[PDB]
Amino acid sequence: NRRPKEDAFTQQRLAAINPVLTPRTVLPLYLLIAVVFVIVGGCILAQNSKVDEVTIYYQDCMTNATSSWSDIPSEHWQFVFHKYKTYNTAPQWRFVDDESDDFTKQRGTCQIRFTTPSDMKNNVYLNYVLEKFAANHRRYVLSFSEDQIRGEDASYETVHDATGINCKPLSKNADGKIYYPCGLIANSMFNDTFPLQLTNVGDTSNNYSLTNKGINWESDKKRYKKTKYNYTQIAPPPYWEKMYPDGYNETNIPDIQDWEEFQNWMRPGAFDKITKLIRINKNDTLPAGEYQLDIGLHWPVLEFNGKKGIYLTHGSHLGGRNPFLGIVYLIGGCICAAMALILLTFWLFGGRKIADASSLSW
Amino acid sequence: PIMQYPRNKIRTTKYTPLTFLPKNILFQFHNFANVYFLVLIILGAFQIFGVTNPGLSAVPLVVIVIITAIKDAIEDSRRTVLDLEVNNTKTHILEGVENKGVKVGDIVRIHNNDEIPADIILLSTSDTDGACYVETKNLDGETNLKVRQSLKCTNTIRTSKDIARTKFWIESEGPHSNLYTYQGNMKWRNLADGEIRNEPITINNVLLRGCTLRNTKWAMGVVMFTGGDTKIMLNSGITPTKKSRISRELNFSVVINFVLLFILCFVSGIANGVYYDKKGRSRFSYEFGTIAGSAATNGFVSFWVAVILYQSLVPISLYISVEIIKTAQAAFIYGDVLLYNAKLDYPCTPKSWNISDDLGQVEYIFSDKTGTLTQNVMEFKKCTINGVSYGRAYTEALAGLRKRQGIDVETEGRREKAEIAKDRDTMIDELRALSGNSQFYPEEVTFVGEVQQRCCEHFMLALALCHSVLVEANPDNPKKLDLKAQSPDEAALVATARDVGFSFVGKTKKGLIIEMQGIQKEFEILNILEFNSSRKRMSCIVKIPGLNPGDEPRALLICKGADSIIYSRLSRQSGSNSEAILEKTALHLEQYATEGLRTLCIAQRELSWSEYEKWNEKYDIAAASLANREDELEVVADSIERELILLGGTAIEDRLQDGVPDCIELLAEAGIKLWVLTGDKVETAINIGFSCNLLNNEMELLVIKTTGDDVKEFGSEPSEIVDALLSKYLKEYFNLTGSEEEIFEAKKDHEFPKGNYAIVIDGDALKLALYGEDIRRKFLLLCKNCRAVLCCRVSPSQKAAVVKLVKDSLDVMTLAIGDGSNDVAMIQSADVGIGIAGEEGRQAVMCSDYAIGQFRYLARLVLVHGRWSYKRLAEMIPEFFYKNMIFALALFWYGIYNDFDGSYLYEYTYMMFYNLAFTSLPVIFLGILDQDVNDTISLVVPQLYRVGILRKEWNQRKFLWYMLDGLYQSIICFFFPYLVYHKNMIVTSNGLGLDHRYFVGVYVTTIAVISCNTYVLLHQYRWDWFSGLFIALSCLVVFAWTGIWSSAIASREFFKAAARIYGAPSFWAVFFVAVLFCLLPRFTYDSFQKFFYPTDVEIVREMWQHGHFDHYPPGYDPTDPNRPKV
């Protein structure tokens, strides 16, 4: 007949647990969430305070550094060593002008000499820090060619007029050749030639190696693949034309599949601080000692008053020294205990009790 | 082509299945949030606004448009089956070998007792020269047998073997949309003879579409011409839809969401204008400048970037969320087996699937009495004739139970003791039943001078003569045939005359077949008038023969009506005994109202044909005239009833529709102020208000009760009596509630009033109370502080003006449950529109918003299904503006860090699937399947309903606190991913770099999805398995999507975000704590509320963890008569 299906879903009677938030259940829950997060707030800062980091900003080598060794001023270097034994000693820095680069806005070689008192563990990450560089703007972050990233010999039409991500201001140059790493992102590539070693000075004179292999994710070689251009239809980007002065040969096209500094730079940073891996050493522990780092200065940052730096770290599983997660899990545990202390001391020593059914309509 | 005939169906549905799609699309874009996506998708195609995937930018629009289309197609599906069933469910054979279905020019054969879906033109029938009888039921209040005398000329056809030799249809002009006219005339050419003929076709020859044919056979005629020539398609069928308060106060919540949406776009515009006139920036050297413009036109473009950027703040799936939920809340109203009438086989039918939350916030219920609150099957007789009362009953003589003892069955045996002495002495000359539960009133009628013994026998014949009862051939035992009446009170008087001996066998063409006291006379009824609900009158003018042979036979006039109409139609001075009976017979009906018995009255004047043959012709000229459906018939039918001699009144019973345990025991101790709108009299409604418990003991019954009833036509200019008296005690009943008329403080005060104070206004006193200003506001303030308003709301304008006086002058929800054609003004005028399905499908059900089999189901429909669907939707809508707030502002807070240049944080498949898959389903299932308490506890504690009466759940205050909580959690779900990056931008365990903004977007999204859906989970009562599965599945689809989208190379920059972000412990570290700080201040505010200032429903749910409701069975129905005890 015309009778609805009594199947306990049309009857609105399903298997509910139906919680009622009485203080005999929620006050254990606030106690549980608090006592978990002060343990996680304890265990994070037990891991996070032990992280050692070296932050040396070198944007002022070409001005504020002599050819002899002077100390870095207090603003540029930041040292963190939780074994507080050599934390106040300044690193030193010279500048070899080389007189032949003829660019004169950012040239030379800033040689940075720092001293670490504690040995960083077996994974040492050398990052470059860029403050005030604006890698997160609308036209910037959409300026590349995914088909050029995937090694396809893309024509001018598929790099210029592509939907969404396309290399609009930098599709091709004056004489009609497209740019192979076209776009503002690949044009804006952080130049500075970091060394393939940290040359240990004085005490040992055995150089601590730094590889440029393994700098990006290993799975990122599935979208960065070797290009298929015939070397006559491509050109380097207009700010790459000093590292490729005669354009491209038949042999000097960069394989972006194994050129991982490109693969880190083609991942634009989200904020006004860019920190990208450039040199790793997975093999060796870096002992305590005085190291020299020879940065060929080529990437100019002073015209936008921005900082340009170095981040030497063995970051933890959380990555980097950032006290935010430890402070928050403590604040999360200290609020969930204080809100339990409020909702228990207002519950007993004054307040109300669940003793009546005469609280609704009396 | 020439004579312009296209083919068409019967009734349109305004969604034609060939032209459904383009008219649905333009209907979708009257929504401003919907057309806001047509802006940001056409601005998506232009490259200067920096949106990747512009072709995929259409996906959260096209998915919403198709789902609103397949909802509109499903809402067309149960709509078009009303028009499809009447269109072509049947087709006649139309055999033409001798040379319900639509065909222009057909010669169709129509039998008895069926609907005619056409305009048939009558030619002949089985009767004398085409005398057709018709019951025009669904057009007007036409309860007579409207005579349709056809042509006396073309009565030669019997079969379809001679009329099918001519194939022709006639030509007519355009429609006129009026009932009583037909300006068509058919002309035909004779065979082998030069005689032209114009058959005069008038309203007496034709009948309309939506009527019911009775008693005539082989109705032959011609189907109408195409177009809109049927005169019912414009008079009735085009009805204005309604939406809830919450669906009307939603449009202010959408504007606050768009005012915020254009503040954020404006801050994105002016703070990127401030960026492009900064002097030393990176957009000079590396980024080549001038994206669109130089200085401020670059910031003006960045305004419209933010319009496309904040495309998840615009509520696009709001209106499909409110309409899926309202549909599923009504499909559970439909699919409830406790709202199901087993005896009638009728589930509760929502005619409006979009006002379910209106059933949760109603304060005034305007039920009518006899059809709705009572069974409307009338059993007892209780005759009164000539100043003495004939009948004994104890069914409702227990109405005055305030002064009587406990059990009284000794008088109930005296009924049967006098009943078995009644079937013997009445079976001396009768061959009807006259048995147990056949005869109705136990009373010795004179043990059959002495004029009283005739006068009771003259009453029962004249009662049987003034009837609208057609006999019916009883199929089992055809020797005793039964009775049928459209008015069931009118059947009980006729079923009992059959028991006293004045039965009637049948009904001839002009007169009537009647079996009075054994002998079978034929009273000839030449004239009769109709019954209207406003007139309260059914009268016959049956002709009698003269007693002495060789005279002029006079006639009678038996008017049957109420005890207040014909007492205003009664002869004052007379030389007979027509005066001294009145203080007897009105004293009996006062005794026969206070025992709850429905009353009638019958008077009779001895007219002559010297005064009657003019009034007959005055009615007969006005029987085929223009005013046959106007009010000019009653003034024609008033002049001969100026003087009357009263026979007596009758006092039949009407037992209740077992809506005693709801009417206060659920449904007015809910908090709702109920309002009976009877149409019966004052004393019988008070003593039926106690019986249905509506007004109870210790309740002040302040009665308005105008004393004199007369019409004014001249004089009375310096003074006033008949209107000044009811104005002054509306002031004098304002010492009970010590206030005055002037102010509406009560409009902003919805509250169940302390102090009982029922109101018993009636009839003419109501007309004077709603005539002019300063008495309407004075009556209505007395009607806010009451709990029950009662009686004599006859002539449904009084029922419809009262439901509109409270609905408009107080911004309040009204319900007005009813049945029958006298409530199609009351039901349609109210906010909610419940109707009662009787034995047949009546006009109130089809014009209703819900339709239940009895009044008994209104308690579960209002207190369970409505009170849920209020609190479901009053929670859902602040959760929907919450879920867009947490997500679409956490890429506003990224605007600080890209200098508001509008580079996307969320990859655009997280802005696609946010309102569709990631968090759409928990808010849907909070709206569909949330119950604050069980369906049993909803009826055990019905004071839970007062949160809708108080409007304490949905208000714009709550909406602002859910935006501000969403704006807080937007700060948490962005700056907690931000401050794990802000120090040194290395968040991976292996130092490899997640610094891309899409990877920070996964940090921000996954916090904002799980803390959204747990915010929905923490705000639903009863975590059931089904919504609990799809809160878990909506949280684990935002991981499943990046598992399978960031594992294809097609996700360009987003290539392997599953393995890199979920392999990173800093994701899971901030995911487990920025879901804390999102949910913690609300779960603190909710836990501080539920401990120290709890609502009623936390008090009830704290009683529910205890065993305060374990006594009650599952599916408890305390208004069901056969239920166990608590």
Ligand SMILES: *[C@@H]1O[C@H](CO)[C@@H](O[C@@H]2O[C@H](CO)[C@@H](O[C@@H]3O[C@H](CO)[C@@H](O)[C@H](O)[C@@H]3O)[C@H](O)[C@H]2NC(C)=O)[C@H](O)[C@H]1NC(C)=O
């Ligand atoms: C990476 O290194 C190169 C040099 O090692 C940096 O210098 C860029 O060099 C190109 C060509 O040498 C400059 O283009 C020139 O600009 C002048 C106007 O200043 C114009 O007259 C010439 O015709 C030519 O186009 C380019 O301006 C210069 N870069 C800047 C920012 O000034 C380069 O900057 C380093 N960085 C990047 C991201 O490549």
Ligand SMILES: Nc1ncnc2c1ncn2[C@@H]1O[C@H](COP(=O)(O)OP(=O)(O)CP(=O)(O)O)[C@@H](O)[C@H]1O
């Ligand atoms: N068939 C009939 N013949 C004569 N009088 C009738 C009648 N049906 C009703 N009446 C009388 O007319 C008066 C008004 O009739 P109406 O059409 O209002 O019925 P009602 O008021 O009882 C239905 P409701 O209770 O839903 O308002 C009633 O008091 C009734 O006594």
Ligand SMILES: [Mg+2]
């Ligand atoms: Mg009724």
